[PDB]
């Protein structure tokens, strides 16, 4: 099967700057009638892949003319003349000249922006959940940049590492930031035994962590 190799794996680009990414195929993609079945696609966060370029060099239907495909034979390039935040996502190449048809592994376009500290919010277990046996404490770390961040949980000032589950959003095209949710799950009985709960976020916008806490049984 034809191997489609994309590089780089990821690219970070400031809004208004160009981008270029490469797709190299293990066999030539020209066919016996002069057509090159090479497409580029973009998959935006939470969407299906969508058309961009086809026939190697042709803009597909309705696609912004900021996208240009070039190349022939085995070596293809996608250029964006000036990046917009909504261009972020994973760009794929695809070949339809040689059965079975194959896709590249994807190049992720990230938008570079100014640093932003997270907004940190902590939430106690709901009364409804406490009637059930379990107790989840949730911390949101929202709208930060760059994407690396660390969260630490404390119960009555002591670090708790077990029972924590984290989840991360993809980059937002509206403000080019990232967000994270961390949930600490305990039994209802262990939660009701302790008093203070703390979420600490460490990020490069500040030298000391951002700390949000509550006491159980206080509003």
């Amino acid at each position: 099967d034809v191997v489609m190799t994309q590089s780089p794996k990821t690219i970070s680009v400031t809004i208004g700057q160009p981008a270029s990414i490469s797709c190299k195929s293990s066999q030539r993609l020209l066919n016996s009638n002069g057509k090159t079945f090479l497409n580029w696609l973009l998959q935006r966060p939470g969407q299906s892949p969508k058309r961009l370029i086809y026939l190697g060099t042709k803009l597909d239907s309705g696609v912004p003319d900021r996208f240009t495909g070039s190349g022939s034979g085995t070596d293809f390039t996608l250029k964006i003349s000036r990046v917009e935040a909504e261009d972020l996502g994973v760009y794929y190449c695809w070949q339809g000249t040689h059965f079975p048809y194959t896709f590249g592994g994807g190049t992720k376009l990230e938008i570079k922006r100014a640093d932003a500290a997270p907004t940190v919010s902590i939430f106690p277990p709901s009364s409804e959940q406490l009637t059930s046996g379990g107790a989840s404490v949730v911390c949101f770390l929202n709208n930060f940049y760059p994407k690396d961040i660390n969260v630490k949980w404390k119960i009555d000032g002591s670090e708790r590492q077990n029972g924590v589950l984290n989840s991360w959003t993809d980059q937002d095209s509206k403000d080019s930031t990232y967000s994270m949710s961390s949930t600490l799950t305990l039994t209802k009985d262990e939660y009701e035994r302790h008093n203070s709960y703390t979420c600490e976020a460490t990020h490069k916008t500040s030298t000391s962590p951002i700390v949000k806490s509550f006491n159980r049984n206080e509003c």
């Binding site: 299906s48 086809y54 079975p100 919010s121 989840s167 206080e218």
Partner: protein, 222 residues
Amino acid sequence: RVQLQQSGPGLVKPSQSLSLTCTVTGYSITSDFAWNWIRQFPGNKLEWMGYINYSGFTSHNPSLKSRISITRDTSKNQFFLQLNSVTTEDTATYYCAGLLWYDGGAGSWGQGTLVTVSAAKTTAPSVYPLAPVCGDTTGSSVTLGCLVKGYFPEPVTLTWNSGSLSSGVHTFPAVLQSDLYTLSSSVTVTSSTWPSQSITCNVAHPASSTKVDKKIEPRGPT
């Protein structure tokens, strides 16, 4: 223009078959296109499965040998996927996608349908309100949230105020543990608007036919 939509069961037991439908609107399936099935695994990995074209001719990936059938019903303007002998390795988002036969142009994909291959039981979620602590409501914005816990399989849908509240929302990828998923969502509004303008998270879990509309009540007197 052509529009595609997948449908079919989202949870399949190991060793049985997945059976999906693509409904095409805006174009006849007997004209111009190749009608493809493509699946996406965790990791940006896309696999072409096969097509049936406008004349009924088919082709499929040798990676799926003997397991795949792609068919059509022209009276319904639909085409179909059957994949038998499934295993957990077939858990993927399945897409239908039409590309023109002549040039590969005009590619149009459905929204995708998750198929989970698992023996685990369907379980409806509990939807818990995340009400802000008093001390974090005195600023110019306030964050609230919703915790959707203990469901299987994916997906759920989650909106705020019936989709009328869409800015300032972060809905996070679900986490799986012990064959159950947990998802959270946050929403941030101008603090002076709350609690005068209520905020409700609307959760639906189609696989269990369950909906929860949970209004977020302040901590403190309500």
